[PDB]
Symmetry: D3
Subunit: 167 residues, 6 copies
Amino acid sequence: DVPNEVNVIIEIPMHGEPVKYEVDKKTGALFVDRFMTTAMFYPTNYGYIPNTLSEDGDPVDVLVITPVPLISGAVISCRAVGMLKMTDESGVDAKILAVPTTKLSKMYQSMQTYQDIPQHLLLSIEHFFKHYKDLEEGKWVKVEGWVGPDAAREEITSSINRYNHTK
Amino acid sequence: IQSGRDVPNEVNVIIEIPMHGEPVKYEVDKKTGALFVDRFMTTAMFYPTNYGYIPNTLSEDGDPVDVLVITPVPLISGAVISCRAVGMLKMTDESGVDAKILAVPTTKLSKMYQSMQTYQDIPQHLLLSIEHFFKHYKDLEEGKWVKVEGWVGPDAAREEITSSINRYNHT
Amino acid sequence: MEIQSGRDVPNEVNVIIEIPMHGEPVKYEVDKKTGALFVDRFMTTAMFYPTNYGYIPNTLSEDGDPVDVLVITPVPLISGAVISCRAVGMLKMTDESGVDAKILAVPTTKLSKMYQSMQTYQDIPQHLLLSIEHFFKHYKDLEEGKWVKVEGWVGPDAAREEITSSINRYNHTK
Amino acid sequence: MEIQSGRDVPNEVNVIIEIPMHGEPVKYEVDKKTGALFVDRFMTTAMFYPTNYGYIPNTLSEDGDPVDVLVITPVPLISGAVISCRAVGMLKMTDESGVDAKILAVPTTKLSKMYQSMQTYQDIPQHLLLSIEHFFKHYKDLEEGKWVKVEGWVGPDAAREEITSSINRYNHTKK
Amino acid sequence: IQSGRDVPNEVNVIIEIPMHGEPVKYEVDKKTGALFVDRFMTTAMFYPTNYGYIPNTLSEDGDPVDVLVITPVPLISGAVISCRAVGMLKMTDESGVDAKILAVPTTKLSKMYQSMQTYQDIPQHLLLSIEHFFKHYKDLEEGKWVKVEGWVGPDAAREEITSSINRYNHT
Amino acid sequence: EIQSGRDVPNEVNVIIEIPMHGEPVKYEVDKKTGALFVDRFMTTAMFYPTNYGYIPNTLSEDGDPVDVLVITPVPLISGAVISCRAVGMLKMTDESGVDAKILAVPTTKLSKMYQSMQTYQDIPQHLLLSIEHFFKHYKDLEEGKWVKVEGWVGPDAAREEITSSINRYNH
Ligand code: NA
Ligand code: NA
Ligand code: NA
Ligand code: NA
């Protein structure tokens, strides 16, 4: 039920080890991209929507909120509530924020837009992505800010399209 | 993945949920082989054993044979373990019958289970906690219920495995 | 322990944690005489506490035990920790030994502002209320001769009355 | 601390846990004088205690140390917890300082019925007995000037005799 | 519990927060010795070392001297460890000056740290993550803030231990 | 489907079977099916002091791929792939013949903290000794097995082992 419901493959569990795992899109294997150099942890699970492409050639990133951590390699059906827009040394870096669908858990039903998310969590997600790469030489992050679920769903749709034209 | 070295005496089990794990109900998508989140558990319970299935089996409900595998320390989701059945827990729920095989690792994996031949050899506290878990872990899932009928022995368990492997080949 | 009942009883109370949320199936209890953390028993169901679990020091309920408190936190606390919290309600039960009330509390706003909008148990996410109720109904199912009947939830006013009466009971015995 | 050595010594004794089973390679020890949990050393081999590890308060071995106890439990305990247990045997050993016997104990029946049939160390699964002996044989292999000589297992009566003798030594230091 | 065997060269540190632990900011009540929850972490950060204080010291701010203790694996809250200062991270926060000692276990506890004599001997990635942690762990605490000044050597660290131990004796 | 490495034999990909400091479960990838099987449960109370895995598309003399110990700052998970480079090799003999295990660190892209690690002598001595001690002893209670440690050799011999085994695999 794209773009309202999407499958996300988890790469990094919430509150996990400072290991930045990434799926190799060619082989489907979970590679270690790098070790984290700040003493920070992902406040949500982190993964991507398969068969998406976006402008920079990588799939659409998704932060998935769950009551307990997921494992790397798991797939979870979720729906977007907003998107954190950012710029870094490489250009734009949007990251969608999503909650599990109601079939997986009814506890997120009232979460429709990013302002519905507990404010403390929005702030720590923002802070994490502003700062987790601070000690990586040659990198910087600027937070443009949050946009709503329509823009998030717009980001999903365009990136699904970009992937379709390529293949 | 072969069903086992010496079916139905020794079988391979693919682990979906580790013992004492997070309240996340993972399931292998049989079509794609991917580990999906089916739902989050709504009771404060954990699986007292590892939980998985025998590949290339077709029980009556159209799903593979479920197996509880006792191990000394937790396994991880996605692992395959060779084991042998010591009994089977027979249940009914809203969809019909729901049997769960109980198994221990084969002697090659560990000599410590060698004296466990039947479910009656398993420590009573663990048998009771397994029954209680499957009786109650879905208590807060709307429209569901569980009735525990009781345990049957390894011969009965092996019959269930054999019957279900045959069903998979024809279907 | 030389710990006090709270910074502003019964609105803010100190709770000594015995069992962490999502912890090992070990039923630890503080020996009220010596202050040592003892293993009372191992749990016999495959269950875990959905919140942290402890007691208010210097309180005396009717049964001779301190007031029990369930403390919600964003991540688990450790056994032996003390946390300042405030009651939002109380789960009333009866068991084979008589009455068994347990207060539900959240950290004070000084400790964490994220709970400031939690004023009554009805503000707590419903799935957690149901999992707490289910845990206490069932965690002792395999303990011979024990049973639990859940009467229901009562509000912050009733919880504070239970605290105050039990603080009063303790002072009289001193 | 004011924790007593046991309700029905030597049949049931209180054990203060210093190191959890399968825990971090940190060798904690209670300062018997102050009751504080100190770091004695870090493990230098990649080994973990196959049981919980602690001691009986108010006991003194022939060399002046409290009686050490290995406590078997279904899940790990935490450092600093107290558990009532009963001895099923004792692994006799010596180290670079003298005697270093370790009692092996299971929770009392009040704490768990699952150990009721464990009466002697030979009732304990052989793999655990061997992993325990192997652990103490080797965990100090990389500590220069430290070693262990394993002298063998004895039954519950010998273990209870050591508890009683050790309680007597402790009382004699107050007498 | 004394300040240490040979102050200021070897000191006892009581651990309040483990390395890589839960985002719970525990603090010992210096009056009673009880481990209280001071607050929860509001950024997604964890302490890159263990964190605690030296008993029987009186810093300028009225609290004991804080110490960051490097260990190969995490310690637990409430444990005491004999250690020695290799340097000090100088900072100021909302309450004033706030130096934190960096220490390693003494050679009796672990010989792996014997060649660590100054903070410059500590791996650079760890020095940087420590600096980054204290720069940012109060970013979402309204009315709390930190400015990180820089590192000073073991002698200056020992000067601080001695200065703060002196105040405790007269007071 | 994973290749042997970006720049063999200087940089190789390693598939992790057993994480550092993990459960005493001896996982192994089935080279035929690619599935992670439980080979056995460990019978000593020991843990791998590094992560443990193998280089895909290699064949050593014993018919198994080249085994690699991978040092990381925090544990990896079973099934992860890590780009690394050899700094030495632990040579042993057992009941089955020769048993070399290469020691590797992450490449500089993954972590700059190992850049100065060029040979096994660069590795902290305590870790080298604990690795040696682990492989000498973790199979002590496995019947019919024994280990003799011949010793460590340098990165050139390690790469020679890698290079020959890549050829042997192609051949
Ligand atoms: Na079934
Ligand atoms: Na030695
Ligand atoms: Na040592
Ligand atoms: Na601030």
